[PDB]
């Protein structure tokens, strides 16, 4: 009974807010103050990078194209790290600026390159905020420096992390590079968790300011399963990576993600009346991913009901005709629309 139906206690997290979600199912495994609005500091860069990734996915420009450093990037010497006006730097180098402590000039140069001005780019950032359904996020700048007013939340930063991975995977593969060239200089990635040999961490963005505290969006995998954590307003230097490691590790220990049905696969067969054939093939039009307590796969039950006494032609491909019900311990934990996998026209 009890160890099986157990609800795991959540580790203490020495931070102001956090959330732990599964990349595939979207399930929230743990959260604290996940919708509280806070300054994300350099985490803002995740959205900048999302837009750039969309631009590249749309084929507007590529990693080899040369970019011109404007009086723009400069305006925001003794140092080799800074892009000087008039130099030409490949996109490949600039976008990897996301992995740096600064590299704020690179954000500006890329923003002008992709959308003409910093303010129009920000306009695109806020547009995507809206397209992703984010309720507690708004940006003022492309790098988050001088934006006393910029805000996001543990939940929204996690969701932006999820979007990068999902929508712009080529932009995302950049985050795990431990070392890369930036402005002719060999630089190390700021995400120390990439070097942790206990977990397989491959993203995403860490940041710290005195005002916003330590901030980190991370993502890790274990075989076929991927988790995303967001910990904001982390209080100590010592916990800057350890708090998230603990959270991710906990997630993998107590939860597992299953893929009970993929699109196109016949979940069930059903008789159809009045059609050019007499059997309908039923499934889903979106892959099914469920996150359940680890070790309960075998207890997962799947069934379905039909939205009407029985099926009549005509049926359209992907026509919703019922509901798939998944349960654990008699309880229904997830429902999904049952769809017709192939059209059955009237006889």
Swiss-Prot record:
Binding site for substrate: 205
SMART domains: PBP5_C
UniProt subcellular location: Cell inner membrane
Record pathway: Cell wall biogenesis; peptidoglycan biosynthesis
One GO biological process term: regulation of cell shape
Membrane-related topology note: Peripheral membrane protein
Keyword list, A-Z: Carboxypeptidase, Cell inner membrane, Cell membrane, Cell shape, Cell wall biogenesis/degradation, Hydrolase, Membrane, Peptidoglycan synthesis, Protease, Signal
Any one of the GO CC terms: plasma membrane
EC number: 3.4.16.4
Active site per the UniProt annotation: 42 (acyl-ester intermediate), 45 (proton acceptor), 102
Reactions catalysed, as given in the entry: Preferential cleavage: (Ac)2-L-Lys-D-Ala-|-D-Ala. Also transpeptidation of peptidyl-alanyl moieties that are N-acyl substituents of D-alanine
Pfam families reported in the protein's UniProt record: PBP5_C, Peptidase_S11
Example GO molecular function: serine-type D-Ala-D-Ala carboxypeptidase activity
Family indicated by similarity: Belongs to the peptidase S11 family.
Role this protein plays: Removes C-terminal D-alanyl residues from sugar-peptide cell wall precursors.
Descriptive protein name: D-alanyl-D-alanine carboxypeptidase DacA
Organism listed in the record: Escherichia coli O157:H7
